Amino acid sequence: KEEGHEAAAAEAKKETDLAHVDQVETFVGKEKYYVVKGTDKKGTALYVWVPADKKAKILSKEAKEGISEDKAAKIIKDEGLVSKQKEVHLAREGNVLLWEVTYLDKEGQYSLSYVDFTTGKILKNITP
Ligand code: NI
Numbered sequence: 698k699e700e701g702h703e704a705a706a707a708e709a710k711k712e713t714d715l716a717h718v719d720q721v722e723t724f725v726g727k728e729k730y731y732v733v734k735g736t737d738k739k740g741t742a743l744y745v746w747v748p749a750d751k752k753a754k755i756l757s758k759e760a761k762e763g764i765s766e767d768k769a770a771k772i773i774k775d776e777g778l779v780s781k782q783k784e785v786h787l788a789r790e791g792n793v794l795l796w797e798v799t800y801l802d803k804e805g806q807y808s809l810s811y812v813d814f815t816t817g818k819i820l821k822n823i824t825p
Contacts, residue, residue: 705731709745763814769796
C-alpha cells in the first residue's frame, strides 16, 4: 500500500462524483497532491486532485475536458524542444491543473515542461 493513497481515494469518493477508483498516484511539486483517476456512476472518466494540505481545495475534471497525455507530449515535441520523449504525468500546482511532460531536450538535458490540462498552453519549461 502506497502512503496516503487509501485516504486520498476515500476523500475523492466522499467529496466528488467519483464512484470507482482505477489508480492513485502521488504528485510532488511545489505542493503534494494525490491524483485519483476513475469513473463516476455513469462510467464517465474523471480525475480528482486531492491536496495533502487539508486546507487546500480538491479539484476534479472529466478526462474529456482536458487534452490527452499523448497530446501534452505532442505539444512539447511540436514546440521543437525534445530529443527523446520520456514520461508524462497528471499534475497540479496551486489551482492550475497540468500535464508534466519530461524529456531529454536538444542539449541532451533532462527537462520538464508543464502544459495546461485544459488549454494545452505551455506554462513553464524547466531544466533542473
Ligand atoms: Ni459503476
